[PDB]
C-alpha cells in the first residue's frame, strides 16, 4: 500500500541541496550512505545499517538491467570507493554527492557509467 516512487522523492525534497559530510547524519551534513538509512527508516520503517560496507550486504543482488525505483545502486566514488544512492526510474537516482550534496543524477553520466559496481534490492 505504499507509493513507493512519491515517498523517496518526498524524502529528496526535504533533503535537497544538503550539504556532503562523511560520517554525518543530520541537514547540516550527511553522507552517502547516511542518506540512504534515514531515507528507508522515514520513509518504509526499514532500519538498514550505517556504512556502506553493511548496505551492499542487505537485500539481494540485482542486475543493472533489473533495476526499479527503490533498490540501491552502488559506485566507485567518494574518498571510501564505496558510494550508494537509491534508483529512482528514468535511469535516475538520488544520493548525497561528495561534490554537491543530495542531488538527482543518472546512471548514463559518463561520470557514474564508469564507475558503477552493483545494485541491490531491499524492498519486496
Same mark, same amino acid.
Not at 12 to 24: C, E, F, H, P, Q
Not at 76 to 103: C, D, E, K, L, W
Given at each position: ?5 512519491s515517498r523517496i522523492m518526498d ?13 554525518? =547524519? %543530520? ?8 542518506? $540512504?538509512? /534515514? ?6 520503517? !526499514?532500519? *538498514?545499517?550505517? =556504512? %556502506? ?8 543482488? $540485482?542486475? /543493472? ?6 533498490? !540501491?545502486? *552502488? ?9 550508494v544512492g537509491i ?38
Amino acid at each position: 500500500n505504499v507509493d513507493v516512487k512519491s515517498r523517496i522523492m518526498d524524502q529528496y525534497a526535504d533533503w535537497k541541496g544538503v550539504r556532503y559530510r562523511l560520517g554525518g =547524519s %543530520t541537514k547540516k551534513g550527511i553522507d552517502s550512505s547516511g542518506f $540512504v538509512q /534515514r531515507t528507508f527508516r522515514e520513509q518504509f520503517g !526499514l532500519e *538498514l545499517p550505517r =556504512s %556502506t560496507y553493511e548496505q551492499q550486504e542487505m537485500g539481494k543482488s $540485482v542486475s /543493472r538491467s533489473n533495476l526499479r525505483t527503490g533498490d !540501491l545502486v *552502488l559506485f566507485r566514488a567518494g574518498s571510501t570507493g564505496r558510494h550508494v544512492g537509491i534508483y529512482i526510474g528514468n535511469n535516475q537516482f538520488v544520493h548525497a554527492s561528495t561534490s554537491s550534496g543530495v542531488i538527482i543524477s543518472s546512471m548514463n553520466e559518463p561520470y557514474w557509467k564508469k564507475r558503477y559496481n552493483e545494485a541491490r534490492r531491499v524492498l519486496s
